[PDB]
Amino acid sequence: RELKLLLLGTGESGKSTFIKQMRIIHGSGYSDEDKRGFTKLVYQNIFTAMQAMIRAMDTLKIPYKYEHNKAHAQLVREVDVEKVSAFENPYVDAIKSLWNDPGIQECYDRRREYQLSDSTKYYLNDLDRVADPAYLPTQQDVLRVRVPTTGIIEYPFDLQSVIFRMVDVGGQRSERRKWIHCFENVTSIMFLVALSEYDQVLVESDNENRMEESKALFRTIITYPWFQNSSVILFLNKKDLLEEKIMYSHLVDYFPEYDGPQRDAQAAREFILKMFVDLNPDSDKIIYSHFTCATDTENIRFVFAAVKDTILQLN
Amino acid sequence: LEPPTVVETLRRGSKFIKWDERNLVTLRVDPNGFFLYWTGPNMEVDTLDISSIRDTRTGRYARLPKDPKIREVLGFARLEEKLMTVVSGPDPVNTVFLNFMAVQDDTAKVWSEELFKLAMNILAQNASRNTFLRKAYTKLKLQVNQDGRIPVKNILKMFSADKKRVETALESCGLKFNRSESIRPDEFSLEIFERFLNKLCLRPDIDKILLEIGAKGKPYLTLEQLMDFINQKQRDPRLNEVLYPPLRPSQARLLIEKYEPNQQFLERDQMSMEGFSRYLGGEENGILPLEALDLSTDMTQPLSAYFINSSHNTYLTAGQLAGTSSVEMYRQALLWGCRCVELDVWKGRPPEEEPFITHGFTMTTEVPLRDVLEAIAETAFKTSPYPVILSFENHVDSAKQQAKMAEYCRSIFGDALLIEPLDKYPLAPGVPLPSPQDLMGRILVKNKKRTDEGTASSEVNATEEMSTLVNYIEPVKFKSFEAARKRNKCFEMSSFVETKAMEQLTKSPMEFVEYNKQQLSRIYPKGTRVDSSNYMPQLFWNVGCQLVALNFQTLDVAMQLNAGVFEYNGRSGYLLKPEFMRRPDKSFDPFTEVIVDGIVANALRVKVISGQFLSDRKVGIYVEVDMFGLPVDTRRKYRTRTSQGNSFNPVWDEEPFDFPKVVLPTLASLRIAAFEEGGKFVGHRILPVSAIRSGYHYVCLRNEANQPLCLPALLIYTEASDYIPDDHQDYAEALINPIKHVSLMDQRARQLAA
Ligand SMILES: Nc1nc2c(ncn2[C@@H]2O[C@H](COP(=O)(O)OP(=O)(O)O)[C@@H](O)[C@H]2O)c(=O)[nH]1
Ligand code: ALF
Ligand SMILES: [Ca+2]
Ligand SMILES: [Mg+2]
């Protein structure tokens, strides 16, 4: 037999990254041909991150440090991002000059006020490794790409004793109308909450908080009459970005009920788990919680092995 | 896809000696890429439309002179490289040749290559409404009299749906109102033709659009209302909000500087009525996006997962008994985007041993095989570089004569003929068929190895000569579906007749789709249809048959589908099957009545608002709206009431046509056809349900062989959105905005505590 597992969660939360780890751990991994098929999307995420950082300079009114670097800004500002196939010489020379500017690094420090990806520093620090003509994307470079999901895709995975049908859905506000056609015969709901969302606002609505919607989507999901015998497995993604974000920006400003001390990535990790577990009206049904990191293949292999025995014991 | 740019040697105009089976003309193309006009023999121009050119041949592939009177005067070999033949027609059966012979050197090949890029362009065929009104204006500016003036009878025959209103329309603009006078083309600039299509066709349907979207203040549309026009009405509500983002106030100001003409209203960021009536026909407000037309489909799947375009008895021009076969029907089919042609080869004459192509004992004329194999070799990959499958039918019962048709395939096709299998995919059980990208330019033959069918049930066993060419697609005698699955050879195929595949359709449709996930299946119409009537191919596309073969002669409702759904994917003749008909882990019933688990349904709602310029006489016009998909989607066929007698600006006050449960929307296809009173055809347009937008759009109707018409167009208002089941449509409103719902949820629990 097989089981149908849902991967639900809000936008930019790391659902397809959890699928890519299943393709690496419990499936057919990325070979030398499949890694080379991803090299055009790594170039497109370098330009999408930079063009959103260039247009973040005038709306925040931050002047550039060097005037020589400013002449490179209008060159990258007019790159059509979808028609990028190669990474040529004036394109690398402009962005590598644009990354070392102290006025850009002040705009990157204030990246909570616009929409920027979470792998925008992994790419524009290994830019010497990504620009070379013999560029093959390594397996950590493939897990950091950003291709936004639309629709319902069903991935089956063989574990030599049972087959898991992991269903990958979207996360945006226009994509939650399509979640209805995968709610039939659901074994488990793997809810994926990014822990580093507690200061950014939504891309679909630039006023509401990101953590307060994932908190509100978890309240809606487990209070359906439909999911009355389904074991909801709460994943807390992005455990690495919490350790960088908590050291300068706090949790108390965006949540007034945080009594814990500042700069404490372990005590704040419990409080967000205290925030999500407490939204359960029935105490007889319990929620299996797991902190995780979706690009650490050991930290998916350790967690999913604890999930695979949790599903098989209850079923 | 590039816009149709004209190379400057096609605008200055070279000199050809136009001849018909000796007058010197100068061919020119207008600077938009619309017409091909030449100063005729009577000092009057004759414009051949560029968008109705099938092919432009040159070199030794052009038509040679056969009259000794015309051969000597032309100068008859260096004279074989100057001949240019432009073949054009409304249907592939009746084509009008246009022969030219140049006088300068090396100019016939820059012409006939660039003349084929304009006549096979995708952004000119799917161009906007304002592009097609400009095409009718260029038709007036080119066709002049001896004096170089536009006669008023030339404007009168165009809008022949009225006469008295037209003559007073030109009189209001200060032009010549009398019928037998002539306007000079200096005083007929395109600004005046805008005022002439406004003072003649008064449209009250746009004024119900302006009053709807918030212009209670009558003169102008405010900029803040116009962003709320495009982001709500015109935007497809199934798309994502990160991939295709909504507009910005800086972004939706480039439209006002592009469309709004009044500068006293342009500086205040306001769009007038004349600026809004231009925007709906703009290039941005099209019924189909740019990505739906280009070669954008995944071409790496096996060949067993693609709807291949096909043709049955391609060599015929008419019915199966009375007609005359022609070699020209192979060229006119393969340029259309057909990929599977048929060849019924017979044993030749005793003194002149040469095989021919005919029909079996039906008194049809016989064309030689060596002329037909030159036809498929010439124009296989002129419009799409994808593999052509020559469906032979060997009746040659001579082992000697088979070496002639074996050497003809190796000598004429040559490098492109796939003799040996590809190195990645051997001829082993269990390995799938290759991909269409893996054989870009490879011609595959189809022959044997070593009552309702007529000729196709009796064919001789092939010998060692013709069996070496059959490698991947090999026809086998059909036994069952259990023996087709326990054998597990994914390269063999079996061709069904129409009446045998229909009893195999209802006996077991769940096993028919799983046979097409591995192997191919050809379907051809039976021998009872002796008048070349084509069955509906959507009966066999719901079970995933690939080579559904249709008679390309007669363009009934069936051929209007088969030429409509393959215009997409870049006119390549290969549509990808939906994702549940080619995955071996999933399986679904094509005769379902509920929404499939995993397949996103849709809920289409089409409503016909009005029409423009539809016909040339005072008749009534109605509009049919069908949907060709799964048999659960096809149940509703709607039709408007006829108009009062207007063929000029007929308005339909109709309720919307509700297509509520589109179960498989990545297969179904809308069909908006407009007829006349009495049932005379005017135009039709087939749109897929996946990529049809929303809001008040334009539809430019096409004729029967899917060529675009210049003047006639409809105006529809669609609402293509995702289907929510009626049992829980309120638990899908809490997902879309869960912030507002979680504040309302505890509020209903707190107020109950009191
Ligand atoms: N640093 C870090 N980045 C992550 C982690 N998990 C996900 N991401 C990033 O989150 C981004 C968006 O995730 P994505 O798979 O696109 O989620 P989806 O849009 O719902 O499909 C990806 O670019 C990942 O690189 C993590 O544990 N650590
Ligand atoms: F949830 Al997403 F791209 F934002 F899959
Ligand atoms: Ca035949
Ligand atoms: Mg995803």
Author numbering:
A (entry chain A): 38 to 352
B (entry chain B): 13 to 33, 38 to 92, 97 to 470, 575 to 878
From the primary publication:
pmcPhospholipase Cβ (PLCβ) enzymes cleave phosphatidylinositol 4,5-bisphosphate (PIP2) in the plasma membrane to produce inositol triphosphate (IP3) and diacylglycerol (DAG), (1, 2). PLCβ enzymes are under the control of G protein coupled receptor (GPCR) signaling through direct interaction with G proteins, Gαq and Gβγ (6–8). Basal activity of PLCβs is maintained at very low levels in cells via two autoinhibitory elements, the X-Y linker, which occupies the active site, and the Hα2’ in the proximal c-terminal domain (CTD), whose mechanism of autoinhibition is not well understood. Finally, we show that nonlipidated Gαq and Gβγ regulate PLCβ function independently, the former through kcat and the latter through membrane recruitment.
We determined the structure of the PLCβ3·Gαq complex associated with lipid vesicles at 3.4 Å. The sample was prepared by combining PLCβ3 and wildtype Gαq bound to GDP-AlF4, purifying the complex using size exclusion chromatography, and then mixing the purified complex with lipid vesicles composed of 2DOPE:1POPC:1POPS (wt:wt:wt). The structure of the complex contains density for the PLCβ3 catalytic core and the proximal CTD, but the CTD linker and the distal CTD are disordered, suggesting conformational heterogeneity of the domains with respect to each other. The overall complex is very similar to the previously determined crystal structure, including the X-Y linker engaged in the active site, with a Cα rmsd of 0.84 Å (10). Despite the disordered distal CTD, which was previously shown to be part of the PLCβ3·Gαq interface, the interface between the PLCβ3 catalytic core and Gαq is extensive, burying ~1,500 Å2 and involving 56 residues, 27 from Gαq and 29 from PLCβ3. Compared to the structure of the catalytic core in the absence of Gαq, the only conformational difference is the displacement of the Hα2’ away from the catalytic core. Despite its proximity to the catalytic site, the Hα2’ displacement does not induce additional changes in that region. Despite our finding that the X-Y linker is involved functionally in Gαq-dependent activation, we do not observe structural differences at the active site or its interface with the X-Y linker, even with extensive classification targeting that region. Two different membrane-associated reconstructions of the PLCβ3·Gαq complex were observed, in which the catalytic core associates with the membrane and orients the active site toward the membrane. The PLCβ3·Gαq orientation seems more poised for catalysis as the active site is oriented directly toward the membrane.
